[PDB]
Design a protein around this ligand. Structure first.
Ligand SMILES: Cc1cn([C@H]2C[C@H](OP(=O)(O)O)[C@@H](COP(=O)(O)O)O2)c(=O)[nH]c1=O
Ligand SMILES: [Ca+2]
Length: 129
């Protein structure tokens, strides 16, 4: 896999973000995670966490996996990086997302995510408290 440039257009919530990619506005859905909706427990905390990560980043990058690059709603499916740090993984490590939606052929960072989740669970963070 490789990283490609993008720029933030707007934060949305824990696991979606509006980015400009190849010069076109797109909503991205983060691979391999599920954050609570804003109206649910830890929804607001997940959204704040990603908003800060994405807004403070000097450089946003997107990394597509091997499989489908857009979902049935037209959202881009990617791993998103904020100054080199993967948002998908950080969410999970902080107990603000669950590893989820792991489909065959778009699961390159699965074990990375699961290791983070195991550590969040051990620390009883947030969702796991
Ligand atoms: C993360 C992800 C979600 N999706 C689809 C499956 C779910 O369909 P349904 O909408 O029919 O439940 C939906 C969940 O996204 P949200 O968690 O953003 O709601 O997005 C994919 O198709 N591929 C993916 O990699
Ligand atoms: Ca969600």
């Amino acid at each position: 896999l490789h990283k490609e440039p993008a720029t933030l257009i707007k934060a949305i919530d824990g696991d979606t973000v509006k980015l400009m990619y190849k010069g076109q506005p797109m909503t991205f859905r983060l691979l391999l995670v599920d954050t609570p909706e804003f109206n649910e427990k830890y929804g607001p905390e997940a959204s704040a966490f990603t908003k800060k990560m994405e807004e403070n980043a000097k450089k946003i990058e997107v990394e597509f996996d091997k499989g489908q690059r857009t979902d049935k709603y037209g959202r881009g499916l990617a791993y998103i990086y904020a100054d080199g740090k993967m948002v998908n993984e950080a969410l999970v490590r902080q107990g603000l997302a669950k590893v989820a939606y792991v489909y065959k052929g778009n699961n390159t960072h699965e074990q990375l995510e699961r290791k983070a989740e195991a550590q969040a669970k051990k620390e009883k963070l947030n969702i796991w408290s």
